PDB file of C-alpha atoms and ligand atoms in Angstrom:
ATOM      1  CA  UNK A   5      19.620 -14.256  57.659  1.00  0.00           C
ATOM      2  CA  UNK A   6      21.787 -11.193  55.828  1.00  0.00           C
ATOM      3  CA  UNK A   7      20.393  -7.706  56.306  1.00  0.00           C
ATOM      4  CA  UNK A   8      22.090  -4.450  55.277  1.00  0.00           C
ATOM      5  CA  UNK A   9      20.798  -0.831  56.596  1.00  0.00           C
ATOM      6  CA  UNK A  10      20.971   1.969  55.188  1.00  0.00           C
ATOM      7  CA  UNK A  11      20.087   6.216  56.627  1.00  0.00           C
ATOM      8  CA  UNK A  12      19.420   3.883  59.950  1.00  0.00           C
ATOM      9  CA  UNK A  13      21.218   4.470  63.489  1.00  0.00           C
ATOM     10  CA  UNK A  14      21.431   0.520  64.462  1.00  0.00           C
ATOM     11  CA  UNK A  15      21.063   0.788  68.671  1.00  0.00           C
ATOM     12  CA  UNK A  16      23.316  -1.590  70.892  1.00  0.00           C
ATOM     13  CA  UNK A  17      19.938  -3.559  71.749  1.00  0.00           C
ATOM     14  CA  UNK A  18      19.202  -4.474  68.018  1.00  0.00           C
ATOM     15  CA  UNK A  19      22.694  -5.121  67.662  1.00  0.00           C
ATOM     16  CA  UNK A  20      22.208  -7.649  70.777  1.00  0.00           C
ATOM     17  CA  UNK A  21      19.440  -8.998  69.327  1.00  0.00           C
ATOM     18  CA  UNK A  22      20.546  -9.656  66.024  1.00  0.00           C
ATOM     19  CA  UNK A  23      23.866 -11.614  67.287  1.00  0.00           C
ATOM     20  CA  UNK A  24      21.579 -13.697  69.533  1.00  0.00           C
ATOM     21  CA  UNK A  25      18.848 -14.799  66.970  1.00  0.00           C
ATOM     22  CA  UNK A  26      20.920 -15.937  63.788  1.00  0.00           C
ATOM     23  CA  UNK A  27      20.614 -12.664  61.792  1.00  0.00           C
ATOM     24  CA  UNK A  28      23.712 -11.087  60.999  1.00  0.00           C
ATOM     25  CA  UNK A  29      24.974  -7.429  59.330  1.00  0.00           C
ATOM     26  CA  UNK A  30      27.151  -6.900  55.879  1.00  0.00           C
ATOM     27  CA  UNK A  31      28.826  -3.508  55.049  1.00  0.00           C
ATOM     28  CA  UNK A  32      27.326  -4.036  51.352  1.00  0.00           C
ATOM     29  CA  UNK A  33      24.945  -5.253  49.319  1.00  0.00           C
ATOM     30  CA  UNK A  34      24.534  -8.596  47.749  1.00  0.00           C
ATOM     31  CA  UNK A  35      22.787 -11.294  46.138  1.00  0.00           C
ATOM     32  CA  UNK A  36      22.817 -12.937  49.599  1.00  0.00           C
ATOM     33  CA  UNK A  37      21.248 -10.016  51.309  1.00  0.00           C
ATOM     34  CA  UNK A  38      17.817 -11.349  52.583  1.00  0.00           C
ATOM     35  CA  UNK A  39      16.573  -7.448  53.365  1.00  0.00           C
ATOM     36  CA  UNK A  40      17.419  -3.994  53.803  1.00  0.00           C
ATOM     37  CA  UNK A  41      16.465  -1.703  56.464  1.00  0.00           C
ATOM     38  CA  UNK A  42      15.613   1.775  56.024  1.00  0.00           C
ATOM     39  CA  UNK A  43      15.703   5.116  57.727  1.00  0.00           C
ATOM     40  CA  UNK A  44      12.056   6.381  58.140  1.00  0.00           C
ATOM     41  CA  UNK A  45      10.674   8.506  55.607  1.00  0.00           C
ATOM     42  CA  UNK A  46      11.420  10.592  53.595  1.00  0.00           C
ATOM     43  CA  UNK A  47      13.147   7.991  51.798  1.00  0.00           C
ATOM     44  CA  UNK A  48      16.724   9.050  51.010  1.00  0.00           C
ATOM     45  CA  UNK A  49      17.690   7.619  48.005  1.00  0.00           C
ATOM     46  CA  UNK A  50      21.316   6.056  49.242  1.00  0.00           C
ATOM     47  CA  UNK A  51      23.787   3.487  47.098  1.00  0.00           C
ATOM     48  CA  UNK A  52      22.351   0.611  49.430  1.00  0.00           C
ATOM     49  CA  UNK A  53      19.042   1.547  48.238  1.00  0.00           C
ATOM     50  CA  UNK A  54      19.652   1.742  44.632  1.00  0.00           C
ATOM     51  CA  UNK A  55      21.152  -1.668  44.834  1.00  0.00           C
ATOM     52  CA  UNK A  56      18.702  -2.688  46.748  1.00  0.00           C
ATOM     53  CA  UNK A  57      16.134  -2.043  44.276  1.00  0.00           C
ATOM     54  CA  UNK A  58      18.186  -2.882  41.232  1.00  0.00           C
ATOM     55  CA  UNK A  59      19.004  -6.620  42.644  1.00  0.00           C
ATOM     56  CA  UNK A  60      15.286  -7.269  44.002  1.00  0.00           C
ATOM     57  CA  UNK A  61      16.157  -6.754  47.556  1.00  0.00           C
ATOM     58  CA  UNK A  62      13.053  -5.791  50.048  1.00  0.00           C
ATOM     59  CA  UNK A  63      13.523  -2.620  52.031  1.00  0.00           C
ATOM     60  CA  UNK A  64      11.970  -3.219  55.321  1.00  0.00           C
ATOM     61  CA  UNK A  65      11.040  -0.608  57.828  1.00  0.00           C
ATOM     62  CA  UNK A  66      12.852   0.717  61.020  1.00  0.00           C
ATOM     63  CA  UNK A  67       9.667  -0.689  63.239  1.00  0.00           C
ATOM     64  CA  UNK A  68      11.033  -4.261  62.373  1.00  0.00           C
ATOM     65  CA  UNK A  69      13.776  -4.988  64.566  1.00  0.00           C
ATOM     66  CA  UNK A  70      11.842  -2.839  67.602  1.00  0.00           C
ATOM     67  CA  UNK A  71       8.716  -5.085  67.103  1.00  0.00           C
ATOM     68  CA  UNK A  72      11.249  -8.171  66.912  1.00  0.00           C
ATOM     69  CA  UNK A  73      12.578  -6.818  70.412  1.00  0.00           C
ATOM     70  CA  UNK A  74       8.889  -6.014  71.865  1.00  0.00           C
ATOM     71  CA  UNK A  75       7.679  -9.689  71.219  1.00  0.00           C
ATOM     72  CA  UNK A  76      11.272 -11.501  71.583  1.00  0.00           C
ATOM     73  CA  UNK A  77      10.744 -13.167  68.076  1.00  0.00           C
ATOM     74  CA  UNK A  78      11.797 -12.577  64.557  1.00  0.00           C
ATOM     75  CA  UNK A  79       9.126 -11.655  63.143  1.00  0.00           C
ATOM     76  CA  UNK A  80       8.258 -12.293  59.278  1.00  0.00           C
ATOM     77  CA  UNK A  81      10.120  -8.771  57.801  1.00  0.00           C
ATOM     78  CA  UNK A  82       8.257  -9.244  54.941  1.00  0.00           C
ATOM     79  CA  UNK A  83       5.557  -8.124  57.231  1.00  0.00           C
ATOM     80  CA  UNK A  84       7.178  -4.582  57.527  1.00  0.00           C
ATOM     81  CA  UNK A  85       7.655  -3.864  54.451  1.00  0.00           C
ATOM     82  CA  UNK A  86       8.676   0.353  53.680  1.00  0.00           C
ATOM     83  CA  UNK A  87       6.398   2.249  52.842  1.00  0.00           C
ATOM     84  CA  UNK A  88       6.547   5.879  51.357  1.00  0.00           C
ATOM     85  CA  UNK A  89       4.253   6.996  49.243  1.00  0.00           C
ATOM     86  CA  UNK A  90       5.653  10.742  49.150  1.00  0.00           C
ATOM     87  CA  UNK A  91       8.601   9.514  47.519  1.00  0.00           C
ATOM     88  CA  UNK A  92       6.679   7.281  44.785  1.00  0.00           C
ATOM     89  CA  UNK A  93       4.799   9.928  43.390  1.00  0.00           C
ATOM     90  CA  UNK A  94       7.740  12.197  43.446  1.00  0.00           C
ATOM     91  CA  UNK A  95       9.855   9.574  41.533  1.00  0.00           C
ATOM     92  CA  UNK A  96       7.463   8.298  40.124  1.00  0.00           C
ATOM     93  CA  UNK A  97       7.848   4.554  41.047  1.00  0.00           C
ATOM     94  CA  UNK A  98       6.440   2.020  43.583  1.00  0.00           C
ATOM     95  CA  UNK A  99       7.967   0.364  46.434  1.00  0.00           C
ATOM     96  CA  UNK A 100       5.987  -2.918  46.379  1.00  0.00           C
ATOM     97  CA  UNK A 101       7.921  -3.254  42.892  1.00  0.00           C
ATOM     98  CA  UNK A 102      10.486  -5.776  44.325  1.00  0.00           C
ATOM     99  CA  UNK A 103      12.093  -7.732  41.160  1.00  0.00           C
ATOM    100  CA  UNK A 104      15.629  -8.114  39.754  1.00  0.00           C
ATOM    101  CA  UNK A 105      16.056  -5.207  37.170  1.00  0.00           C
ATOM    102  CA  UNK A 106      16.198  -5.752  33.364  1.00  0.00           C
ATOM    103  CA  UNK A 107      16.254  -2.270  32.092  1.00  0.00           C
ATOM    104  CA  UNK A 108      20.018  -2.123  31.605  1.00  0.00           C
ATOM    105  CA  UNK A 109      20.696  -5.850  30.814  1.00  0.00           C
ATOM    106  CA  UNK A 110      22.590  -6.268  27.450  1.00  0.00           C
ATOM    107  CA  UNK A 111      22.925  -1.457  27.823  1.00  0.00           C
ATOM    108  CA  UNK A 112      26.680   0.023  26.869  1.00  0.00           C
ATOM    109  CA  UNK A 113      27.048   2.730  28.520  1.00  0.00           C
ATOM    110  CA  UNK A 114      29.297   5.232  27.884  1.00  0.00           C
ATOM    111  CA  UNK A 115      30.540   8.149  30.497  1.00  0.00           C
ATOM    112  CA  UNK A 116      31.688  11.177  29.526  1.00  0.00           C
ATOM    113  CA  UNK A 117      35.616  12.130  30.672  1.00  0.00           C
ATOM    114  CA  UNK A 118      33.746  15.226  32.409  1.00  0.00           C
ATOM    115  CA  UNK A 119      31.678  13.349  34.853  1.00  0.00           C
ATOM    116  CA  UNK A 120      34.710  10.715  35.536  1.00  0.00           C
ATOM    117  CA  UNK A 121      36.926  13.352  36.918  1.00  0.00           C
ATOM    118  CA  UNK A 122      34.182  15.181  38.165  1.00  0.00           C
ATOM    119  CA  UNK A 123      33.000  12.332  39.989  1.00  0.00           C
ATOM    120  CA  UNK A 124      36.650  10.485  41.251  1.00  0.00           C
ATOM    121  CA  UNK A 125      36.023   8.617  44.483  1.00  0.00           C
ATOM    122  CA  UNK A 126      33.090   7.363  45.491  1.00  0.00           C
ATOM    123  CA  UNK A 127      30.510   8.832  43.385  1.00  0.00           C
ATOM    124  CA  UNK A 128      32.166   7.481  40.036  1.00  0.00           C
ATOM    125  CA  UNK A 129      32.605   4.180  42.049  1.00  0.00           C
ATOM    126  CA  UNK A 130      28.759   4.125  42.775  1.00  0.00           C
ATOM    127  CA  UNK A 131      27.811   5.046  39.057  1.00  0.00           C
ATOM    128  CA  UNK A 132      30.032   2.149  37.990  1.00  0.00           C
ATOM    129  CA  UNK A 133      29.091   0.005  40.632  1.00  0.00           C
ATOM    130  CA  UNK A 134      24.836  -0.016  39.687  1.00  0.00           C
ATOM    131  CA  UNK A 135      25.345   0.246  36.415  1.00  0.00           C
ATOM    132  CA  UNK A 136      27.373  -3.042  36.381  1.00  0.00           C
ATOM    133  CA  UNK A 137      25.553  -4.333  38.714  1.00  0.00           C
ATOM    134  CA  UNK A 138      22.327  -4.303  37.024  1.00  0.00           C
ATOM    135  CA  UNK A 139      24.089  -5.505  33.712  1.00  0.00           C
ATOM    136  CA  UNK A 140      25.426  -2.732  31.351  1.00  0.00           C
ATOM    137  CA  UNK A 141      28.628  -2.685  30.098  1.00  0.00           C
ATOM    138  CA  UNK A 142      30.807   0.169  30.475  1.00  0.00           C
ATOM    139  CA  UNK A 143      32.316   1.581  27.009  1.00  0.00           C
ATOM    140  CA  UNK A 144      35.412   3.566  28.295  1.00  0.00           C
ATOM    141  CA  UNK A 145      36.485   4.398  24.359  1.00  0.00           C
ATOM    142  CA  UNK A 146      34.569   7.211  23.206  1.00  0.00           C
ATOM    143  CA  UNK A 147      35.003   6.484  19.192  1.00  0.00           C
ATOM    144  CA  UNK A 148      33.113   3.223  20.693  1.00  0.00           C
ATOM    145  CA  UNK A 149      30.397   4.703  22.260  1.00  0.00           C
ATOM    146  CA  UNK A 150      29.433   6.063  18.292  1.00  0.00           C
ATOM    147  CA  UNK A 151      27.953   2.221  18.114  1.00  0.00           C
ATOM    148  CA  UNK A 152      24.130   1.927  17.599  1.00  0.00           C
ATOM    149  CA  UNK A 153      22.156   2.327  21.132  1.00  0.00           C
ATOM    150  CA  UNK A 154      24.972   3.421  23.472  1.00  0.00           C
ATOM    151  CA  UNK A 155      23.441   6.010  26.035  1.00  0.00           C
ATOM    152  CA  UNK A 156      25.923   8.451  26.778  1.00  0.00           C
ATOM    153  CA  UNK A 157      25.893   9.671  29.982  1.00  0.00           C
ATOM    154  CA  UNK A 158      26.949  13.748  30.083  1.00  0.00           C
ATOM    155  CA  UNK A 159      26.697  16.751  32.142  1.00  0.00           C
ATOM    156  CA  UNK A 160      24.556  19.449  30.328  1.00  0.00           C
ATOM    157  CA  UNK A 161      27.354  22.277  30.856  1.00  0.00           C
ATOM    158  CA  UNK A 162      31.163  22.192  30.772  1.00  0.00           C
ATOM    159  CA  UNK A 163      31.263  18.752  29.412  1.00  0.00           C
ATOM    160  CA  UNK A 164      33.400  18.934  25.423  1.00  0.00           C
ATOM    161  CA  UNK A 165      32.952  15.097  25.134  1.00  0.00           C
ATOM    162  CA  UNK A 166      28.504  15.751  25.615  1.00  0.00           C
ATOM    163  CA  UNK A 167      29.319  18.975  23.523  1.00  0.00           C
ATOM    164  CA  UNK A 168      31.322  17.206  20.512  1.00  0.00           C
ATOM    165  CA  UNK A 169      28.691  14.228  20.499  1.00  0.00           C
ATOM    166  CA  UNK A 170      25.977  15.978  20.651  1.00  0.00           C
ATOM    167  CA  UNK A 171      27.285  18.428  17.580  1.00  0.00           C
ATOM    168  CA  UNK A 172      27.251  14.881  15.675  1.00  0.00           C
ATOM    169  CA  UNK A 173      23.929  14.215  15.867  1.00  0.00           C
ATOM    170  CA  UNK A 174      24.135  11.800  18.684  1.00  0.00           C
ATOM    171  CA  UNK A 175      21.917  12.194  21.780  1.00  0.00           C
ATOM    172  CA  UNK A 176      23.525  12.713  25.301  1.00  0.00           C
ATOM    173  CA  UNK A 177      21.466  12.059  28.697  1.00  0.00           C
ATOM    174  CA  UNK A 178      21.800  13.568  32.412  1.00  0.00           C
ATOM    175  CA  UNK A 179      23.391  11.248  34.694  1.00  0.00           C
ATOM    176  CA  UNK A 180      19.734  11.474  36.977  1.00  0.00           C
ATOM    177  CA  UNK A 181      18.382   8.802  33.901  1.00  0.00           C
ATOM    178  CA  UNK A 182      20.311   6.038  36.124  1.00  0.00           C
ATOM    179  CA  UNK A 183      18.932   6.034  39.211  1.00  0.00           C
ATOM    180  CA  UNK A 184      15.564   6.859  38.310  1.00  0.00           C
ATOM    181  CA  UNK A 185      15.625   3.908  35.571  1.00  0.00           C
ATOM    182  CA  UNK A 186      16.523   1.547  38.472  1.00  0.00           C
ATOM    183  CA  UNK A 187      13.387   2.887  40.284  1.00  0.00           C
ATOM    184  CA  UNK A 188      10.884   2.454  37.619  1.00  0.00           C
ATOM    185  CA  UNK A 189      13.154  -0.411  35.799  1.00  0.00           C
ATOM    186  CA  UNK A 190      12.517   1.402  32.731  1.00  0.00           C
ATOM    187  CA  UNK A 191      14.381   4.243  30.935  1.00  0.00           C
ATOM    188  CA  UNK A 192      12.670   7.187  30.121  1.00  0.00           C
ATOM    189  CA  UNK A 193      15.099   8.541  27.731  1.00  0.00           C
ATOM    190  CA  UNK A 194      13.232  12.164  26.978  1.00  0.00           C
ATOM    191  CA  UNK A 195      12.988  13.473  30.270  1.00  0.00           C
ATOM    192  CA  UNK A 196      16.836  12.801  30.473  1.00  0.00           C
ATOM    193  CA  UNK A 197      17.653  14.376  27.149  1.00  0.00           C
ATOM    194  CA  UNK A 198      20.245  17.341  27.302  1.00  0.00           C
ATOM    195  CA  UNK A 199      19.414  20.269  24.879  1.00  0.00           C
TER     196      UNK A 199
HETATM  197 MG1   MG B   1      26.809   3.065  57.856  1.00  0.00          MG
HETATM  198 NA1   NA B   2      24.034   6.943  56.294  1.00  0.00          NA
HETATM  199 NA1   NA B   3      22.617  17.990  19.107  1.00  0.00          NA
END
């Protein structure tokens, strides 16, 4: 059994008892990850998470691996499932909503040069990384990103490549439509909208 965690301080004695009962740790997120464990409310919405949630991962709570310990078992995690119902209503999603995403299958995306530099390291890498993950394709070409039903992704100040686009007649979107279309695994392209 694969589990990731994520906002979580792992103790040496759930580290013992994970080597000992066949459940083992990855750095990252994948298809083979069986669950997630989370940091107790509020929910911090982290990379793991989002990928989490965009591949159909559960997120289990941080009471799963003490309860494991308590009754020297591993328990059913499916059991403990997260629960934080401050964070639903402020996103506006559900946790209990565990299913592969579709909202970005067959999506070209295209990111303006402003947030790329803006961005280098690891924020740009975890853009790319759920976006691809959850199937869009990344148009890097701007005069591409003029096709039919490409969602540019811009900042709403400093940005010339949102600003040019825009003054086209093309719509531009805040980069806060991504994760919050993972969450609800549907794009809600007007409350994204740059002026
Ligand atoms: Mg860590
Ligand atoms: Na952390
Ligand atoms: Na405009």
């Amino acid at each position: 059994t694969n589990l990731v965690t994520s906002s979580f301080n792992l103790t040496k004695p759930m580290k013992s008892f994970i080597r000992r009962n066949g459940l083992r740790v990855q750095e990252s997120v994948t298809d083979e990850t069986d669950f997630v464990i989370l940091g107790s409310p509020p929910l911090r919405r982290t990379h793991k998470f989002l990928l989490a949630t965009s591949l159909g991962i559960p997120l289990v709570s941080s009471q799963y691996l003490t309860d494991c310990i308590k009754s020297g078992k591993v328990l059913d995690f499916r059991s403990y499932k997260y629960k934080d119902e401050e964070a639903e209503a402020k996103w506006g999603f559900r946790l209990d909503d565990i299913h592969r995403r579709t909202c970005f299958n067959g999506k070209r995306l295209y990111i303006t040069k402003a947030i790329r530099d803006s961005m280098v390291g690891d924020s740009i890498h975890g853009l790319y990384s759920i976006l691809e993950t959850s199937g869009a394709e990344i148009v890097g070409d701007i005069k591409r990103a003029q096709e039919k039903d490409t969602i540019i992704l811009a900042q709403p100040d400093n940005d010339q490549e949102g600003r040019n686009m825009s003054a086209t007649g093309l719509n531009v979107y805040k980069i806060e439509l991504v994760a919050l279309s993972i969450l609800r695994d549907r794009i809600d392209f007007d409350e994204f909208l740059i002026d």
